[PDB]
Design a protein around this ligand. Structure first.
Ligand SMILES: CCN1/C(=C/C/C=C\C=C2/N(CCCCC(=O)NCCCOCCOCCOCCCNC(=O)[C@H](CCC(=O)O)NC(=O)[C@H](CCC(=O)O)NC(=O)[C@H](Cc3cc(-c4ccc(-c5cccc(Cl)c5)cc4)no3)CP(=O)(O)c3ccc(Br)cc3)c3ccc4c(S(=O)(=O)O)cc(S(=O)(=O)O)cc4c3C2(C)C)C(C)(C)c2c1ccc1c(S(=O)(=O)O)cc(S(=O)(=O)O)cc21
Ligand SMILES: [Ca+2]
Ligand SMILES: [Ca+2]
Ligand SMILES: [Ca+2]
Ligand SMILES: [Zn+2]
Ligand SMILES: [Zn+2]
Length: 159
């Protein structure tokens, strides 16, 4: 196994909000993202408004404090760090993208599910149906199901 959280109670905090979407939409998209993984694991995710949280959600552009700079609109949409203290577990989203709640631009919910998967310690899949497939794909939020590979992967880490 790579790094895994050694606790089932995992907190998260949204450090800043993208101006592309309204604030509640970002809150909703992120909350549903964690719930996707919560549905198939013994993991419980709780939101923190102020203070220390395991998983920090950040919207930034270009070079932004870590050794992994973003590249403007297109290309890399986001990245996340594996489980661990400090920057570990944190998920950063490229602000040069246009985040949406739909098919247009880049869907935040889908990207968040993928990144949180990284935050939980998952690698990539070669299954085009898997959410941990390396490249983005849009699918209606309610024709959406976790692939068997995603579920097998995450259950091998927790439970
Ligand atoms: C309407 C519709 N429809 C339909 C539908 C259906 C649906 C569904 C189904 C299903 N499912 C679900 C899921 C899956 C599905 C599928 O498959 N789908 C497919 C689709 C396809 O489409 C096509 C098109 O495409 C497009 C795409 O585009 C996009 C692009 C982009 N990309 C890129 O490239 C980017 C950029 C962009 C710009 O430029 O801007 N980039 C990227 O991405 C990067 C890369 C770069 C490089 O590398 O260089 N990357 C990044 O960014 C990263 C981050 C991220 C990621 C992400 C993501 C990922 C992934 C994803 C996904 C995928 C897939 C899926 C999903 Cl859900 C998700 C997402 C996202 N984000 O972000 C970076 P990173 O990684 O972080 C990194 C960083 C740094 C470093 Br140093 C490292 C790293 C399903 C499922 C499942 C299943 C199964 S299982 O077992 O598996 O569970 C099974 C089955 S079976 O059958 O076999 O049993 C199944 C399944 C499933 C199904 C299939 C069911 C239909 C219904 C079909 C229809 C429709 C419509 C219509 C119709 C008709 S009509 O006539 O009307 O027309 C008809 C019909 S019939 O048939 O009835 O006839 C139908 C229909
Ligand atoms: Ca980019
Ligand atoms: Ca962290
Ligand atoms: Ca933006
Ligand atoms: Zn970053
Ligand atoms: Zn990935």
């Amino acid at each position: 196994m790579g790094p895994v959280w050694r606790k089932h109670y995992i907190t998260y905090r949204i450090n800043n909000y993208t101006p592309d979407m309204n604030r509640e939409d970002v809150d909703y998209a992120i909350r549903k993202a964690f719930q996707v993984w919560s549905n198939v694991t013994p993991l419980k995710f709780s939101k923190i408004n102020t203070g220390m949280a395991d998983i920090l959600v950040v919207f930034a552009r270009g070079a932004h404090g870590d050794d992994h700079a973003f590249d403007g609109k297109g290309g890399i949409l986001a990245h996340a760090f594996g489980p661990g203290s400090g920057i570990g577990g944190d998920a950063h989203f490229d602000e040069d993208e246009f985040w949406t709640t739909h098919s247009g631009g880049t869907n935040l919910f889908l990207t968040a599910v993928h990144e949180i998967g990284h935050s939980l310690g998952l690698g990539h899949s070669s299954d085009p149906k898997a959410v941990m497939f390396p490249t983005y794909k849009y699918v209606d939020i309610n024709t959406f199901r976790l692939s068997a590979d995603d579920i097998r992967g995450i259950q091998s880490l927790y439970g």
